[PDB]
Amino acid sequence: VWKEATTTLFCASDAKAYDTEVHNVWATHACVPTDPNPQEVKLENVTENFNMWKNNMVEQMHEDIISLWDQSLKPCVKLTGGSVITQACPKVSFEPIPIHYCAPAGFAILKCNDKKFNGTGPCTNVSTVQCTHGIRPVVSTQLLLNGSLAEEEIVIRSENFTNNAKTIIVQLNESVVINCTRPNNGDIRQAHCNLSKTQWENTLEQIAIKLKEQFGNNKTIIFNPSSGGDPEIVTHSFNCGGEFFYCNSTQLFTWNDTGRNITLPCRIKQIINMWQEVGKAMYAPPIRGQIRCSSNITGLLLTRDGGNGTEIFRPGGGDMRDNWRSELYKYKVVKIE
Amino acid sequence: XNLHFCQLRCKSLGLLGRCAXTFCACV
Numbered sequence A: 001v002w003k004e005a006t007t008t009l010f011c012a013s014d015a016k017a018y019d020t021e022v023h024n025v026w027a028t029h030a031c032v033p034t035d036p037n038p039q040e041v042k043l044e045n046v047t048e049n050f051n052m053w054k055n056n057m058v059e060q061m062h063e064d065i066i067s068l069w070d071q072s073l074k075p076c077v078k079l080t081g082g083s084v085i086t087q088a089c090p091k092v093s094f095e096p097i098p099i100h101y102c103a104p105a106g107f108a109i110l111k112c113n114d115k116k117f118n119g120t121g122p123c124t125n126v127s128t129v130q131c132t133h134g135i136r137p138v139v140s141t142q143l144l145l146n147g148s149l150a151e152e153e154i155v156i157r158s159e160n161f162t163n164n165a166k167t168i169i170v171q172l173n174e175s176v177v178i179n180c181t182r183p184n185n186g187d188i189r190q191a192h193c194n195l196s197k198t199q200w201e202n203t204l205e206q207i208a209i210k211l212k213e214q215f216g217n218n219k220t221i222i223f224n225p226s227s228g229g230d231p232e233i234v235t236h237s238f239n240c241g242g243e244f245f246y247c248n249s250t251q252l253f254t255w256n257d258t259g260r261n262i263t264l265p266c267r268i269k270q271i272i273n274m275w276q277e278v279g280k281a282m283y284a285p286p287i288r289g290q291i292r293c294s295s296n297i298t299g300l301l302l303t304r305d306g307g308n309g310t311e312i313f314r315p316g317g318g319d320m321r322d323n324w325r326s327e328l329y330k331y332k333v334v335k336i337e
Numbered sequence B: 001x002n003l004h005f006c007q008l009r010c011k012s013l014g015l016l017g018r019c020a021x022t023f024c025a026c027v
């Protein structure tokens, strides 16, 4: 059979040499062109166990995205372990592109095609592919953006639902658009995000149904804002156009069972806690002009309080491996022979 | 993540701290 194995994955993309955006530049040196002749092969009468929570593809993507950021997005000052480095800190063009992950000779990527798939255990519809689908390496907290939707229902996934310390990854089946803008213009660090109130509320209702299905139909489901910690995880934080946005998500995550837009206030920050490694980095003040990103919310990261009658869920995230996991969950690498 | 300082900060809110990757998260 094909034992799961660690190998040198390589990346493929549609990066262009002439595009100075940072993902394109990184990809031009680090990746090959997207596969011009994809071939998925159904494996007949094969059942295969997956485990999305222990998948070395996740670690390899993690290290690639760290390298992409470290090469591309240089802070003026960085503090790690009580040591300070300073360097030139040019602003850059920043918009993620899809990257595919590919197996070299002697290895294969297996893909689980089961509709229900909870991420662990046997899969009865398995195929082999040369490369994964294209995944945008979006670094964010709380909300998963520009990812892949579930096919017919919301799916929630956790390494262990009974353990309240394990993050719940929610995959939506209908995306909710979110538009975030620092206006051209006042206060250069003031920004905001708009989304449809009825779409968001309907999304919360549908997630709650799935949480009830998992935890008990006698349960009442509550959403509440983050209990606290670093700004990065108390807010919905992301990079838009090279600037770090910290958006107050209180309105998104204050809900119980019993205008037309939600507008989230946001700030652009120069001093951030790094995701790549423990430390802090300081960037230059924002560029001038309209800074705007329109994103599809395709998933969420939640934590449950636990510790009766009611279940409170709060926005989570922070470990970007769960972001990668939210797209890599259906894949594993095996060694042929 | 800096766990001690995370716990230090969250405890002053009546919550334990734990790492979320490289970030401090209160519980």
Ligand SMILES: *[C@@H]1O[C@H](CO)[C@@H](O)[C@H](O)[C@H]1NC(C)=O
Residues within 6 Å of the ligand: A113, A125
């Ligand atoms: C297995 O998955 C593939 C791809 O999603 C699909 O086309 C095919 O119909 C599935 N087969 C069965 C028996 O469900």
Ligand SMILES: *[C@@H]1O[C@H](CO)[C@@H](O)[C@H](O)[C@H]1NC(C)=O
Residues within 6 Å of the ligand: A118, A119, A120, A121, A122, A158, A159, A160, A161
């Ligand atoms: C996923 O489904 C399998 C059965 O195929 C089950 O044993 C496992 O507990 C599920 N994963 C969970 C509950 O995290």
Ligand SMILES: *[C@@H]1O[C@H](CO)[C@@H](O)[C@H](O)[C@H]1NC(C)=O
Residues within 6 Å of the ligand: A146, A147, A175, A296
């Ligand atoms: C956003 O979602 C819509 C519909 O779900 C899709 O057509 C569009 O390509 C998505 N955009 C990105 C960047 O994934």
Ligand SMILES: *[C@@H]1O[C@H](CO)[C@@H](O)[C@H](O)[C@H]1NC(C)=O
Residues within 6 Å of the ligand: A151, A152, A153, A154, A173, A174, A206
């Ligand atoms: C999305 O999934 C929900 C279940 O969570 C279902 O009620 C709805 O019909 C689905 N809609 C689409 C467009 O997939």
Ligand SMILES: *[C@@H]1O[C@H](CO)[C@@H](O)[C@H](O)[C@H]1NC(C)=O
Residues within 6 Å of the ligand: A160, A161, A162, A163, A164
């Ligand atoms: C899931 O987590 C609970 C609570 O920590 C634990 O008691 C249980 O054994 C876990 N289930 C596993 C590890 O299969």
Ligand SMILES: *[C@@H]1O[C@H](CO)[C@@H](O)[C@H](O)[C@H]1NC(C)=O
Residues within 6 Å of the ligand: A177, A178, A179, A194, A195, A196, A261, A294
């Ligand atoms: C988001 O922007 C798009 C155009 O980029 C627009 O069609 C849509 O209505 C906007 N949504 C909100 C909630 O502002």
Ligand SMILES: *[C@@H]1O[C@H](CO)[C@@H](O)[C@H](O)[C@H]1NC(C)=O
Residues within 6 Å of the ligand: A248, A249, A250
């Ligand atoms: C986020 O918005 C809520 C609602 O106004 C507010 O109570 C809270 O103080 C805000 N957070 C910050 C850090 O300002």
Ligand SMILES: *[C@@H]1O[C@H](CO)[C@@H](O)[C@H](O)[C@H]1NC(C)=O
Residues within 6 Å of the ligand: A095, A096, A138, A145, A146, A238, A239, A240, A241, A293, A294, A295, A296
């Ligand atoms: C999502 O994709 C759209 C279209 O490529 C892009 O404009 C937007 O900046 C993306 N959002 C994030 C957070 O990368």
